[PDB]
Write a protein that binds this DNA or RNA. Structure first.
Lengths: 226, 236
DNA sequence: TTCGTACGCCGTACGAA
DNA sequence: TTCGTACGGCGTACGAA
């Protein structure tokens, strides 16, 4: 079924994945097509298929590969708050570095490659110490993973949009001002209007915001532990 | 520009029969193909074929496919069955909103793929839906930026949970291999991973990952319940 | 193992009915 | 307003060296 059960038989899987990552970073996941990645290696297009069954598969391999960039200690430590914060910050760093992770990862089956499993051991590890049911642990970590991914999924959404359309967030908001006005005036959308200033140009910036929400989230996990 | 600033062309002035092809009609057909055979099928040719129209005839009403999908997104959000005012029971209000969104997403799995997550969708249906959600916590005396944070935490939980639920669904469509089946075929490899000894936590959590104790509905609710509890704490 | 050729998809530019 | 034709992409099946 999966690619971690389907091992490969210069040109190698490891070399194709690392090239696909390089194209994806440099020119966006849409550029990392079989021909372009093969061109990058000097290979024939279909030569890649000897090492990688399908493109869906190549992307899963791409996903695990980049996760391996994570700089994480072996043991999480006793400061679960600090541990989860670090894991969170490294993931955000990663995603910003590889914006295509939000698009590429189709979200069905979990990725059980080595790098993902290492990363997940660390996260699941932080709360393993405490006396909680398996299903409570998964819930609490789901809430954690949720906050981080969602926040970062938006951050990276704008980034990728900016690449494709050469129109960044300040610029998009600027050009929507007129229509926003119409919406505000319509009177049919009070809340939208109350919240527009902060939506267009936020008081505090992404780093500050990511931290606050994380801080709150961890606080609630703490409450759940008691 | 965006699409909510780019209306379909005015028809020529005439007392005689209208002529079928319109933006509203193209969107509704794209949604139907997307639901029936998955977003990948709802291509310009397939949607035109559905209407009996020529492929490029659609482009008179819709600038780009990226645009058609935004229109698709707002269209389906309009299916939300929601009261006008949210009510005083913010917990009840948010629960309902959450359940309806999940219901929606399960009904239109392509929402996870379609919605690219950059700029917000400022179509009518999205704005109505957002008014209701933002509304629930408007009553309380909180800074704009606190309100957005608290609602972001909410939207986070719901989307992430549902994004996985729907991930499996779509995968099952494409590969004809559902979740039970995938887990079943991964058993061997999970064994190897468990035995390796290099992944204790993975092993501790495998039974529940393969075949969960409680099911999606029960699980979605628990997490939501917890999430709301923390928002409650934040209000105090 | 390597890879050239080919098929059937896609979004959409162009220009005439 | 409609849309046929065409261009340059895509993933990948097939079959030959």
């Amino acid at each position: 079924v999966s690619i971690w059960m389907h091992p490969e038989p210069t040109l190698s899987r490891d070399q194709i994945v690392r090239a696909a990552v390089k194209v994806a970073d440099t020119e966006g996941v849409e550029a990392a097509s079989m021909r372009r990645v093969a061109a990058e290696l000097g290979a024939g297009t279909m030569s890649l298929y000897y090492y990688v069954p399908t493109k869906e598969d190549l992307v899963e391999l791409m996903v695990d590969e980049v996760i391996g960039e994570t700089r994480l200690p072996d043991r999480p430590g006793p400061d679960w708050r600090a541990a989860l914060t670090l894991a969170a910050n490294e993931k955000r760093a990663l995603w910003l570095r590889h914006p295509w992770l939000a698009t590429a990862w189709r979200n069905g089956h979990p990725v059980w490659g080595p790098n993902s499993l290492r990363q997940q051991e660390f996260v699941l590890g932080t709360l393993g110490v405490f006396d909680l049911q398996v299903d409570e642990l998964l819930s609490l970590i789901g809430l954690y993973n949720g906050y981080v991914e969602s926040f970062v999924r938006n951050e990276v959404g704008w980034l990728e949009e900016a690449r494709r359309t050469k129109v960044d967030m300040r610029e998009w908001m600027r050009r929507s001002g007129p229509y926003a006005q119409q919406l505000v005036d319509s009177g049919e959308y009070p809340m939208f209007a109350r919240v527009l200033a902060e939506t267009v140009a936020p008081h505090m910036g992404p780093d500050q915001r990511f931290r606050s929400g994380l801080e709150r989230l961890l606080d609630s996990i703490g409450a759940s532990l008691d």
